[PDB]
Design a protein around this ligand. Structure first.
Ligand SMILES: *[C@@H]1O[C@H](CO)[C@@H](O)[C@H](O)[C@H]1NC(C)=O
Ligand SMILES: *[C@@H]1O[C@H](CO)[C@@H](O)[C@H](O)[C@H]1NC(C)=O
Ligand SMILES: O[C@@H]1[C@@H](O)[C@H](O)OC[C@H]1O
Ligand SMILES: O[C@@H]1[C@@H](O)[C@H](O)OC[C@H]1O
Ligand SMILES: [Co+2]
Ligand SMILES: [Co+2]
Ligand SMILES: [Co+2]
Lengths: 434, 434
């Protein structure tokens, strides 16, 4: 797609700290940009929609190439349309925003300049952020994660994409998502099937795969840390059900691991660590600090800070594994005890290390879940299982929770605030901000 | 040996913090006791010495068993004879102390009660302490480390030892030391050869081997972190040159690894990290905090704190290894690049994990080095090598430094202060002391 300017595009600014091994941190100035799927897509020379509701214009978009030639992405009113605001080092995302139309949620990327994404090399480094999840009930997810996206959003590879990172193009993740309206500078109208339960979405014949580091999938009830390897490290198109992932009838036939090696302290048995109020170790009614360290071995370490008290990731015992580091031994034990082979089939932490050794883009989002009602994060899943099934219970939410239309109606003012991002060598981010 | 009471034995008290994963720490009260080698050894029913200078009484001690039956260890005047003092959570050790005679240095163990050593299970936990090394010049070592000693000092195994932990019996380390006057409730007079260069020491026909975790071998110029595995984990006697270690003509024929997998930031190339004054990252003229974490994988992590600024162990690149965690990959790369096979011959970190999985005793000491002038820590070693030999340079001290008689004459008022010991689960020790 190209870019149009019926609405101007002004990326909300956002600062973050880059810290050094020598003990100081210095302020960086970036901004955030909304993913292209949230945007108005219209004809290049009029206001006629190329996509409307969950269907494409059959005349403007008869096939993927013609559609991309005829159509452009336009600018975003971040606060009034999308409920996205920033202040200094803080970003807030509202759940349901009413303007002329209803918008639900957002997916945002951190920029280096107004036309390029910021890339982070995670290996050997740590990433720290503060988060307020107090206003996230069952069925919502304020996610902060990384994906192996191109810094330009795909422009150099696909010259029929001229909109680029400035307009939030180029997304990929470990689900090989097929709901994207543009992939590789072509539309995804070919094979499009509108969603049965979502007025604004569908599934196309192509998907967009890459490595994904889920630092934070969370609400006020549950949280998880999850690497997802792929056999191709960076962004790559996939074909139909060959994609695998959430958007295909077969979850596992593709190049990415859609399940991941997840670490959820509740799921692993410590039901007292994280939740609302003073009966939990970390009180989710109040702001907390989350630090994630990528040691060169390929293992992942984690600690938290709240009211100046520090907590390592809680210890877990699973089969022959014991400890609080997310390493090969954990992931292998998890597959043995909870089931599955997707993580190891795709190469485990050794393959994942190829992603963190290269550049990945920071993503911050708020969403509800039209495919599985977020039950995989905060409830019992599958819902026929009981607590006697190892790993079935991931949180305290009812198995009836998180129906999107319900939570949209009941909790429209839900929101997440991410703040005080700090990045640098392991051991550096707790030192004074510049 | 038995115990005599011509001089009373009052262990200087010392407190330390035991911290919990839930974020609090509580004060523990222990004490310190001096190793039996520093003590007066005399006949049970008179003041006649069983050992004097560096030789044994041929009448009281004609063989190892008769010697132990005839002889006892007596009490220690900690401050006036040995230059050992405590205050609250702080311990100070002076280098040369003049009373009726000259004493040099001390080796002390932390006690649980007045008759038992405190045992720590390091695996899954971290150990934090503050140290002032400002008064330690080239050739001295204020060492803090752990060894796999019996809590009773060997009494239950060797009933001819009735003095026990109260009198500092039962020492062992990864050198299989043969300079000990009592091992396994017997004397070590059989095979005794007085030291050519030390008026107070010698080498006997037996040694005492066990696993050794050198958390801190250091002075104001250099510091090293070094695990040493043994094929028998806990305390075990050895026979003559079969002992291996520093005290045998053959270093390597025995059950312990006397070299270890050492991590010295200077040796690995960062000559700016640790030293006296403001030109180093950590200024050794001032107190610093040292934290050592034993992750369940068997790898060791390390960070430092000074004036509220936190520094991870510096990154090092050695062969194909890169990072700041002391793991199998580091130790293997170290052997490939610097030379040697002792660490891996004895089983590496997998064998060492058997020690940290069990109980180890805390040792705090100050010494000079009659065998190698501490050159292995703070100088170029062997002294014929240059900086073109990988790993030869370990510190900035002259290869002429650390002659014991010289440093004893020139720096008698040298000293080390260890303080604010805190121990608990990984991530717990930076929280408030109780
Ligand atoms: C030495 O290590 C410190 C701490 O990691 C680092 O800040 C400094 O840049 C290093 N210097 C060199 C020359 O490696
Ligand atoms: C949960 O984890 C916290 C932090 O490690 C720990 O303090 C608490 O005791 C744990 N509770 C249970 C039941 O495991
Ligand atoms: O959405 C994914 C879910 O379907 C899977 O089961 O667990 C990982 C999540 O990212
Ligand atoms: O004293 C030992 C030294 O001889 C060796 O070379 O390195 C390890 C030290 O403990
Ligand atoms: Co195709
Ligand atoms: Co590790
Ligand atoms: Co013998």
């Amino acid at each position: 797609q190209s870019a149009c300017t019926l609405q101007s595009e002004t990326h909300p600014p956002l600062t973050w700290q880059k810290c050094s091994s020598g003990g100081t941190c210095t302020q960086q100035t970036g901004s955030v940009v909304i993913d292209a799927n949230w945007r108005w897509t219209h004809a290049t020379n009029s206001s006629t929609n190329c996509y409307d509701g969950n269907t494409w214009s059959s005349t403007l978009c008869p096939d993927n190439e013609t559609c991309a030639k005829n159509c452009c992405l336009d600018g975003a009113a971040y606060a009034s349309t999308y409920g996205v605001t920033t202040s200094g080092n803080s970003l807030s995302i509202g759940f349901v925003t009413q303007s002329a139309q209803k918008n639900v949620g957002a997916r945002l990327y951190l920029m280096a300049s107004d036309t390029t994404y910021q890339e982070f090399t995670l290996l050997g480094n740590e990433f720290s952020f503060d988060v307020d999840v107090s206003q996230l009930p069952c069925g919502l997810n304020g996610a902060l994660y990384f994906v192996s996206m191109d810094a330009d959003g795909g422009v150099s590879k696909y010259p029929t994409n001229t909109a680029g990172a400035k307009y939030g193009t180029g997304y990929c993740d470990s689900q090989c998502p097929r709901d994207l309206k543009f992939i590789n500078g072509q539309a995804n109208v070919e094979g499009w099937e509108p969603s049965s339960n979502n007025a604004n979405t569908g599934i196309g014949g192509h998907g967009s795969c890459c490595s994904e580091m889920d630092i934070w999938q969370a609400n006020s009830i549950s949280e998880a840390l999850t690497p997802h390897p792929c056999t191709t490290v960076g962004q790559e198109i996939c074909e139909g059900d060959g994609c695998g992932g959430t958007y295909s009838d077969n979850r596992y036939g593709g190049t990415c691991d859609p399940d991941g090696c997840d670490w959820n302290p509740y799921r692993l048995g410590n039901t007292s660590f994280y939740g609302p109020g003073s009966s939990f170790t970390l009180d989710t009614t109040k702001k907390l600090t989350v630090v994630t360290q990528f040691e060169t071995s390929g293992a992942i370490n984690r600690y938290y800070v709240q009211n100046g008290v520090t907590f390592q990731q809680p210890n877990a015992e699973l089969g022959s594994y014991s400890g609080n580091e997310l390493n090969d031994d954990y992931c292998t034990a998890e597959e043995a005890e909870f089931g599955g082979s997707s993580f190891s089939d795709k190469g485990g932490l050794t393959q994942f290390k190829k992603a963190t050794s290269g550049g990945m883009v920071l993503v911050m989002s708020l969403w509800d879940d039209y495919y599985a009602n977020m039950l995989w994060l905060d409830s019992t899943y599958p819902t026929n299982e009981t607590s006697s099934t190892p790993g079935a219970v991931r949180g305290s939410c009812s198995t009836s929770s998180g129906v999107p239309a319900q939570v949209e109606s009941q909790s429209p003012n839900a929101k997440v605030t991410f703040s005080n991002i700090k990045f640098g060598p392991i051991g550096s981010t707790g030192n004074p901000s510049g």
